[PDB]
Amino acid sequence: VDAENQVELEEKTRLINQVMELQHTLEDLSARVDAVKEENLKLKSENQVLGQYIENLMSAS
Amino acid sequence: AENQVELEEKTRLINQVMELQHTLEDLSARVDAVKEENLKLKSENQVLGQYIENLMSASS
């Protein structure tokens, strides 16, 4: 009777915490996104420049 | 009737959890793809770098 409403209350509490944690996890992640795509573009630039230099050193032989 | 109202509330709550899980699963898959490629590129640039400093440290 009132023991069923306390099961349901405890169940909703657990789901509510889950929404909170999910939304936090999701925020941390969305804020890390641009620093990851930025690094990716750097590394692609370095890679291209390095490969191109190796092409020139090797052709000089 | 009143039990139907409490179940709708719980369903909007469950739905919120599911949608947040979906959004997070997608995003973290995307970011992990990019992070995996970054690791591959750091590994590759180190190989190229080391090779340059060898060809140059041979003609010096």
Author numbering:
A (entry chain A): 86 to 146
B (entry chain B): 88 to 147
Paper excerpt:
We determined the crystal structure of the coiled coil domain of human SCOC isoform 1 at 2.7 Å resolution. The structure was solved by single wavelength anomalous diffraction (SAD) phasing using selenomethionine labeled crystals of the L105M SCOC mutant. The final model comprises residues 86-147. Molecules A and B form dimer AB and the second dimer CC’ is composed of molecule C and a symmetry related copy of C. Dimer CC’ is a regular coiled coil, whereas chains A and B are not as tightly packed because molecule A is bent with a bulge around residues A116. The coiled coil pitch of dimer AB (residues 97-143) is 129 Å and 151 Å for dimer CC’ as calculated with the program TWISTER. Remarkably, half of the a heptad positions at the core of the coiled coil are occupied by polar and charged residues.
Human short coiled coil protein (SCOC) is an effector of the Golgi resident GTPase Arl1 and was recently identified as a positive regulator of autophagy in a genome-wide siRNA screen. SCOC interacts with fasciculation and elongation protein zeta 1 (FEZ1). At least four different human SCOC isoforms are known.
